[PDB]
Amino acid sequence: ELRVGLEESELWLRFKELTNEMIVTKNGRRMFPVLKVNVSGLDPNAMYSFLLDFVAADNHRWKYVNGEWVPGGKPEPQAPSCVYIHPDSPNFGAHWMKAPVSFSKVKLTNKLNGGGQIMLNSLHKYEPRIHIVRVGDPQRMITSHCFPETQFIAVTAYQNEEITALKIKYN
Numbered sequence: 244e245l246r247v248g249l250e251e252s253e254l255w256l257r258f259k260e261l262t263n264e265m266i267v268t269k270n271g272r273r274m275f276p277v278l279k280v281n282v283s284g285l286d287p288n289a290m291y292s293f294l295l296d297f298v299a300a301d302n303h304r305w306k307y308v309n310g311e312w313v314p315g316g317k318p319e320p321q322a323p324s325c326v327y328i329h330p331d332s333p334n335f336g337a338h339w340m341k342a343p344v345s346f347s348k349v350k351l352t353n354k355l356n357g358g359g360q361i362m363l364n365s366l367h368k369y370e371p372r373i374h375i376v377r378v379g380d381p382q383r384m385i386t387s388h389c390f391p392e393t394q395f396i397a398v399t400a401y402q403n404e405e406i407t408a409l410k411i412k413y414n
């Protein structure tokens with residue numbers, strides 16, 4: 244049976260209970276925490292690519308008011324559906340299962356300025372989503388896992404001083 248497990252879930256949860264925030268910039272910013280998963284039940288012999296995208300969680304934006312995140316207006320038009328290809332792609336099931344799959348290099352941006360960055364809209368809540376794509380499959384079979392522990396709001400600057408502090412503490 245295919246299982247994809249979130250690594251460092253108790254670290255994600257510490258951020259999620261404050262409401263998690265990820266910085267977006269012109270040139271793109273790496274995430275902290277880093278999204279990492281453990282995989283079992285792939286065909287060790289088969290070849291697969293790992294994809295990461297970010298799903299919009301709400302039909303509204305958010306605002307940090309009196310130390311509380313609250314609904315903050317109508318959404319911006321959906322961000323362009325950007326997909327990040329894990330740099331080990333394509334590779335054997337055995338490769339993906341022998342050690343946690345780490346998306347350490349992905350960069351979140353608020354400007355389309357290339358370099359395989361992911362464009363997100365400031366003050367919008369997103370949920371990371373990993374896809375496993377079997378290579379050479381005439382059926383183009385894909386599997387999708389969502390990680391609700393990893394939800395965050397995209398921000399141009401941290402709003403919660405406690406998130407600023409957690410980021411420095413654990414990073």
Ligand SMILES: CCN1CCC(Nc2ccccc2F)CC1
Binds near residue numbers: 251254255257413
């Ligand atoms: C005290 C509770 N806390 C335990 C440690 C933390 N884990 C963690 C910290 C830094 C790097 C990697 C990690 F997994 C998750 C929650």
